Write a protein that binds this ligand. Structure first.
Ligand SMILES: *[C@@H]1O[C@H](CO)[C@@H](O[C@@H]2O[C@H](CO)[C@@H](O[C@@H]3O[C@H](CO[C@H]4O[C@H](CO[C@H]5O[C@H](CO)[C@@H](O)[C@H](O)[C@@H]5O[C@H]5O[C@H](CO)[C@@H](O)[C@H](O)[C@@H]5O)[C@@H](O)[C@H](O[C@H]5O[C@H](CO)[C@@H](O)[C@H](O)[C@@H]5O)[C@@H]4O)[C@@H](O)[C@H](O[C@H]4O[C@H](CO)[C@@H](O)[C@H](O)[C@@H]4O[C@H]4O[C@H](CO)[C@@H](O)[C@H](O)[C@@H]4O[C@H]4O[C@H](CO)[C@@H](O)[C@H](O)[C@@H]4O)[C@@H]3O)[C@H](O)[C@H]2NC(C)=O)[C@H](O)[C@H]1NC(C)=O
Ligand SMILES: *[C@@H]1O[C@H](CO)[C@@H](O[C@@H]2O[C@H](CO)[C@@H](O[C@@H]3O[C@H](CO[C@H]4O[C@H](CO[C@H]5O[C@H](CO)[C@@H](O)[C@H](O)[C@@H]5O[C@H]5O[C@H](CO)[C@@H](O)[C@H](O)[C@@H]5O)[C@@H](O)[C@H](O)[C@@H]4O)[C@@H](O)[C@H](O)[C@@H]3O)[C@H](O)[C@H]2NC(C)=O)[C@H](O)[C@H]1NC(C)=O
Ligand SMILES: *[C@@H]1O[C@H](CO)[C@@H](O)[C@H](O)[C@H]1NC(C)=O
Ligand SMILES: O=C(O)/C=C/c1ccc(O)cc1
Ligand SMILES: [Ca+2]
Length: 503
């Protein structure tokens, strides 16, 4: 480990340091960009921490780390990124190491949560779109070989949001990198997601505009969504929409009457909720991106709040229009069209043809929280249906290599009020068996050939990190719907059945 510092020679790579770290230690990241998170993480197992610098071109480069466990299963795991960052997901790297995966993570080609480094620098864009995760996986596999004296057995990827788009970019365009992929809440159709996310500030206008809803007005809308769409459509008043596809919300239920001004929506605010819970279309009637589903309150206030959305604003300024003065206030169809046409390095990540991934025997667990208000879960079932149409494969054919799990009462990669903890990361960690942990479910599918039918999530007593299970639920693979039996305790998973009517 100490000596690896000098023996490890990787192409275009400077090894800064190596570091023995024992089980238990609060590893600290004093050189992490100020905007990056977290500032430390616990390793539950003993590792060699390898910190590299990798040159991807004349003015582009990664920071890559490998955390290599003393007790190695033979497995390699890549992690991925978040937002427009910029930041190694150290908690995911620790998560991986903790299960005996030799785990890598890179910073996606720049430091920090801003995409300003992308401006007039397509190599930094290229590392963001595909080249950081890919390159990290190649060198990851190389150095894993050189440290242990043999080749990894199976290659895995784990990522969420931006990291979920990165997982799909791998299945779509780098199919040999990974034998197994968990892709969470993926930021795929990425230009459409930036257009969708940017569009909300144009729809609402600023604070005090007639069209604008305060945070308290949005929470009033969400309460009225549960009145219309919760118990009436799934039979269980848990504040969780088990299948938002059945919910078409009517904001006119809240219309202000003669001289009512409080606890109600005006005409312009009703138009705003209809647009936010509606699809985005553009020039010549071209479809851009689905609605935010009703009930999806988790992370809702990031793009739909009191100021313009940073991720979309920087994309349009730095990457699409190359104009630091582009104004998020006047976003419109010409923007959505230009982003689709520029589409750097095919960051759209909307390829339907998974031939090569399927054929080599690779498996992908796709999943999305139904309570996610930052990345619409509707975009994920549109991708599944796109794959089915493009490849000419029914859901039962796709079941062989690609399953997509709709997790009710789960937010953006974690949180939410349901049985959300499916084991995609530490924050969303539940149990540690294949049936209730998506990373072990991926290992079991790749290694044993036992595909997940359902993925189990749990909520602990009082929404705590651990303890007695209060709610457990077997989340359904699309296009199955979770159906309550109308008799059993709704908190008992045995009270529910994943259903797909064929007659
Ligand atoms: C700010 O600075 C920036 C940095 O310099 C600068 O960015 C550069 O901007 C230019 C544009 O100005 C970029 O060039 C374009 O790149 C696009 C992306 O190409 C990547 O991805 C596509 C895959 O994406 C499409 O397909 C997938 C499905 O597979 C979908 O999921 C996607 O949504 C997407 O589809 C939309 O667009 C398609 C067209 O490609 C449509 O057909 C489709 O229906 C969807 O609407 C890959 O295919 C690309 O791979 C190819 O190229 C790489 C090399 O780059 C190869 O290695 C690889 O082998 C492939 O050959 C790539 O990965 C391209 O889509 C885009 O292509 C069009 O324009 C060029 C001409 O310049 C044509 O040759 C090409 O045929 C495409 O033409 C169609 O669309 C245009 C409008 O975009 C029409 O004008 C034209 O008529 C044509 O349309 C008609 O025919 C179509 C079928 O042929 C039909 O489908 C249509 O309906 C229509 O009839 C173009 O190359 C460049 O990448 C940027 N560079 C960087 C580094 O970012 C930026 O401009 C600056 N900003 C400014 C100045 O404001
Ligand atoms: C994006 O963000 C990432 C991080 O997230 C940035 O990566 C960080 O990048 C910087 C480069 O800008 C890296 O810093 C380099 O690290 C090298 C290793 O540093 C370590 O060792 C240093 C030297 O240590 C010895 O010598 C000092 C005094 O010089 C003694 O005090 C000390 O006790 C050590 O003594 C030992 O060795 C000497 C011989 O050298 C013997 O004489 C002794 O007997 C004894 O054996 C030390 O200064 C430091 O604390 C570290 O331990 C270093 O060589 C080089 O100078 C430089 O500082 C970070 O490693 C890197 N971090 C990570 C995790 O990647 C990235 O740059 C940023 N990117 C962009 C583009 O902005
Ligand atoms: C890494 O790329 C960034 C962005 O262009 C640049 O500022 C930096 O100088 C590059 N690093 C090296 C050592 O070439
Ligand atoms: O990774 C995340 O948590 C979010 C990603 C994201 C990227 C662009 C958007 O417009 C919205 C969300
Ligand atoms: Ca319900």
């Amino acid at each position: 480990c100490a000596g690896f510092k000098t023996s490890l020679k990787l192409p275009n790579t400077k090894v800064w340091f190596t570091e023995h770290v024992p089980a238990g230690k609060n590893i600290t990241f004093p050189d992490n960009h100020p905007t990056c998170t977290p500032k430390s993480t616990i390793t539950d197992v003993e590792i060699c921490r390898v910190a590299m610098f990798v040159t991807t071109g004349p003015k582009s480069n990664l920071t890559l780390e490998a955390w290599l466990p003393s007790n190695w299963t033979g497995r390699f795991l890549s992690t991925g990124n978040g937002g427009m960052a910029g930041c190694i997901q150290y908690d995911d790297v620790a998560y991986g190491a903790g299960f005996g995966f030799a785990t890598v993570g890179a910073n996606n080609g720049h430091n920090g949560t801003s995409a300003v480094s992308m401006y007039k620098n397509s190599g930094v864009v290229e590392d963001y779109v595909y080249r950081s995760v890919h390159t990290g996986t190649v060198l990851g596999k190389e150095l894993t070989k050189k440290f242990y004296g043999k080749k990894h057995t199976k290659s895995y990827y784990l990522g969420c949001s931006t990291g979920g788009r990165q997982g799909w970019k791998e299945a779509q365009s780098f199919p040999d990198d990974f034998d197994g992929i968990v892709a969470g809440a993926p930021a795929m159709r990425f230009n459409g997601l930036q257009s969708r996310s940017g569009s909300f500030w144009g729809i609402t206008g600023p604070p005090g505009a007639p069209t604008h809803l305060s945070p308290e007005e949005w929470a009033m809308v969400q309460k009225n969504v549960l009145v219309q769409c919760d118990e009436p459509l799934d039979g269980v008043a848990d504040g969780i929409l088990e299948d938002p596809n059945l919910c078409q919300y009517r904001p006119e239920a809240l219309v202000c009457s003669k001289g009512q001004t409080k606890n109600c929506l005006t005409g312009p605010q009703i138009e705003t909720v209809r647009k936010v819970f509606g699809p985005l279309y553009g020039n010549n009637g071209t479809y851009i991106y689905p609605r935010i589903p009703p009930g999806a309150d988790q992370g809702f206030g990031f793009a739909i709040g009191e100021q313009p959305f940073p991720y979309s604003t920087e994309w349009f300024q730095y990457v699409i229009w190359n104009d630091t003065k582009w104004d998020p206030n006047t976003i419109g169809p010409n923007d959505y069209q230009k982003a689709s046409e520029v589409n750097p390095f095919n960051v759209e990540t909307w390829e339907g043809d998974l031939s090569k991934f399927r054929k080599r025997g690779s498996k992908i667990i796709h999943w999305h929280g139904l309570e996610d208000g930052l990345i619409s879960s509707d975009n994920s079932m549109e991708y599944y249906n796109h794959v089915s149409a493009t490849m000419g494969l029914s859901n039962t054919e796709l079941d062989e290599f690609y399953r997509y799990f709709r997790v009710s009462g789960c937010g953006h990669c974690s949180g939410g009020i349901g049985a959300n903890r499916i084991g995609n990361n530490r924050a969303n960690l539940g149990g540690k068996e294949a049936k209730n942990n998506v990373l072990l479910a991926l290992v079991k599918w790749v290694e044993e050939g036992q595909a997940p039918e359902t993925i189990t999530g749990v909520r602990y007593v009082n929404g705590a990190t651990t303890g007695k299970v209060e709610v457990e639920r077997r989340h359904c693979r699309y296009p199955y719907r979770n159906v309550w039996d109308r008799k059993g305790n709704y908190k008992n998973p045995d009270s529910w059945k994943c259903e797909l009517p064929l007659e």
